[PDB]
Amino acid sequence: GKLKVLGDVIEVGGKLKVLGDVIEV
Amino acid sequence: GKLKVLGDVIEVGGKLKVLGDVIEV
Amino acid sequence: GKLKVLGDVIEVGGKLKVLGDVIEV
Amino acid sequence: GKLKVLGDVIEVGGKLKVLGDVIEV
Amino acid sequence: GKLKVLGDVIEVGGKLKVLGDVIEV
Amino acid sequence: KLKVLGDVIEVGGKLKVLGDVIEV
């Protein structure tokens, strides 16, 4: 029911960024 | 062996934001 | 000390995605 | 832990309608 | 002057949706 | 793009929606 996030940590231009999806759990 | 993200969706100033933890999977 | 995530929920092609930054807290 | 609505404004037969999903935040 | 939304929550394919009206208040 | 982030509220046993139109 609640909206959660599942993502990956990626290195972009030397900085750590996050790309993920919103999931229902 | 890789860095993943597990988080929660939160409402901040009318916008949907994410607060999460970096985990090793 | 710990790696946390601060991000935004964005609507991309009708799906809810997350873009965020890894931060040290 | 509240029910929210995330939606788009669409023009249907000259009237403005909202098409959205109920989410738990 | 402002655009507001009023609608009913409907169950479509097991998901809760809204097909609401946009009204000027 | 015109969007809405409104609230779902229980009004006499039925779920209703109230919100504001925002530009995103």
Swiss-Prot record, chains A, B, C, D, E:
Function text: May contribute to the transparency and refractive index of the lens. Has chaperone-like activity, preventing aggregation of various proteins under a wide range of stress conditions. In lens epithelial cells, stabilizes the ATP6V1A protein, preventing its degradation by the proteasome.
Official protein name in the record: Alpha-crystallin B chain
Illness the protein is tied to: Myopathy, myofibrillar, 2: A form of myofibrillar myopathy, a group of chronic neuromuscular disorders characterized at ultrastructural level by disintegration of the sarcomeric Z disk and myofibrils, and replacement of the normal myofibrillar markings by small dense granules, or larger hyaline masses, or amorphous material. MFM2 is characterized by weakness of the proximal and distal limb muscles, weakness of the neck, velopharynx and trunk muscles, hypertrophic cardiomyopathy, and cataract in a subset of patients.
Subunit structure: Heteromer composed of three CRYAA and one CRYAB subunits. Aggregates with homologous proteins, including the small heat shock protein HSPB1, to form large heteromeric complexes. Inter-subunit bridging via zinc ions enhances stability, which is crucial as there is no protein turn over in the lens. Interacts with HSPBAP1 and TTN/titin. Interacts with TMEM109; in the cellular response to DNA damage. Interacts with DES; binds rapidly during early stages of DES filament assembly and a reduced binding seen in the later stages.
Organism: Homo sapiens
UniProt note on tissues of expression: Lens as well as other tissues. Expressed in myocardial tissue.
Family: Belongs to the small heat shock protein (HSP20) family.
N6-acetyllysine carried by residues: 4, 17
Domain of life the protein comes from: Eukaryota
Cellular location(s): Cytoplasm; Nucleus; Secreted; Lysosome
Full protein stretch here: 90 to 100 of 175
